Amino acid sequence: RRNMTLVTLLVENGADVQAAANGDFFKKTKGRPGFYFGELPLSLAACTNQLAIVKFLLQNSWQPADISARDSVGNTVLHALVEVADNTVDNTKFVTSMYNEILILGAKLHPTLKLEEITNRKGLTPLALAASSGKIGVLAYILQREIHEPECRHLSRKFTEWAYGPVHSSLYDLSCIDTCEKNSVLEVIAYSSSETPNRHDMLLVEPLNRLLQDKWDRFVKRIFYFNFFVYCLYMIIFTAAAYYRPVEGLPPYKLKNTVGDYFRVTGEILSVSGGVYFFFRGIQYFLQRRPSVDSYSEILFFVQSLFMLVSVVLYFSQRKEYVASMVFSLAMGWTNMLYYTRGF
């Protein structure tokens, strides 16, 4: 009901303040509703944009409110503000400030508590929660920010080093590309099931364009085009074999004569061997995102390879049909060249 006073009376009068509200009305909406500010009254208070009474609860005496009580879904307050940003210019405006605010204050009282580390039960850091939910503006913010102040720099993310007259430079932290340990922001916006249309734009400017532009310059463009031309010669050798196969019915059975014979049965093994490769790469994809069309192009390599493989087994059951399979796989592979453009 947004009342500084009766709030002040009850807490002068011993309200308990770690008291959770966890009816289905607070967790995600049946639709019952609803809604989710994450339970804890301080999370309720900061999330209700009551800067004064989130200040009251924490500076007060009868019980200053504890700041790291993760709620039932493990969302801390900072986890709760990020669940409530909605990428309206003014919604970002007050939550980005209310969040700026709790951290400047956690620095004041309890500087030891590294608080943007506190994970929810699902292990996310509050940033990893913004970015996994396409909250493009808090993510523009936790990454962009530097408070200038005393005890500021424990607070801050991205420090500015020299402003020449036209320009700036900067030094960004970064936790994210190098949180390879747990949930990188990039790992999180890079899956990118992107079923929130809010996701794609948000691989854009603050710490992360300039950096993935920079991985790609340095080592991984170079690795990609090696990883590309190896597929092309896989494709030529797999044409080359399929294209100089026999007619003699029941194949092979056996082959020795002279040279072309030698060169081809090499191309027939070199092909299935790359078939089982993709079948194998594709189960490992299917298993790392065991389970998830988010990845169309992940699929059709697998479907090709399974056609390399229901060919190979048929070449040995001595069904004459095995070609029909291998001809599809071959039509597929040349089509699977298409993806390896992404993005010229």
């Binding site: 590309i177 190098d178 390879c180 990188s184 990039l186 790992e187 890079a190 990118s192 691989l203 993935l212 920079d214 991985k215 790609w216 340095r218 080592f219 991984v220 690795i223 990609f224 990883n227 992404r342 993005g343």
Partner: peptide
């Protein structure tokens, strides 16, 4: 999509010396 080909081709390249 450059970035998905990136975020993986290092994850599938043994977690090695790169800026980090």
């Amino acid at each position: 999509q450059r970035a998905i080909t990136i975020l993986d081709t290092e994850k599938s390249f043994l977690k090695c010396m790169r800026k980090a």
